[PDB]
Write a protein that binds this ligand. Structure first.
Ligand SMILES: CC(C)NC(=O)N1CCN(C(=O)c2cccs2)CC1
Length: 121
């Protein structure tokens, strides 16, 4: 399965699944400062799933590793901003992260395998 470009549609489909998950609700759009005026004192690099989808659709990811780094930043931002490990929105982040990691593993493996095959000779 050595298609170097296949990751992009596989990532589009995974983002559609994440948007169908009720657990993605807090993460579908950039955090609103009006609600959380201290957010940028704690979070240097806001990230959300709509920004990830737009970056992919613009052709501004070169690899699924770059997309994975931005999705992981959504989850690390949540873990940093939560006052409790027993918070609703944080607990939503942890279930969504497990779902994402379970599905991205094959996308990353197939891509890196395809690139190694491209450089075989
Ligand atoms: C788009 C809108 C719905 N997002 C938003 O306002 N969020 C979600 C992300 N966020 C958090 O991760 C936490 C909040 C409290 C514990 S963590 C801050 C609040």
């Amino acid at each position: 399965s050595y298609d170097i470009q296949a990751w992009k549609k596989q990532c589009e489909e995974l983002l559609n699944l994440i948007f169908q998950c009720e657990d993605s609700e807090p993460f579908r759009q950039p955090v609103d400062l009006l609600e959380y005026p201290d957010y940028r004192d704690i979070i240097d690099t806001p990230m959300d799933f709509a920004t990830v989808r737009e970056t992919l659709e613009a052709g501004n990811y070169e690899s699924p590793m770059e997309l994975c780094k931005d999705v992981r930043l959504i989850f690390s931002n949540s873990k940093a901003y939560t006052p409790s490990k027993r918070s609703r929105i944080y607990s939503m982040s942890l279930r969504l992260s497990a779902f994402f990691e379970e599905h991205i593993s094959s996308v990353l493996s197939d891509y890196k395998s395809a690139l190694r095959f491209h450089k075989r000779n």
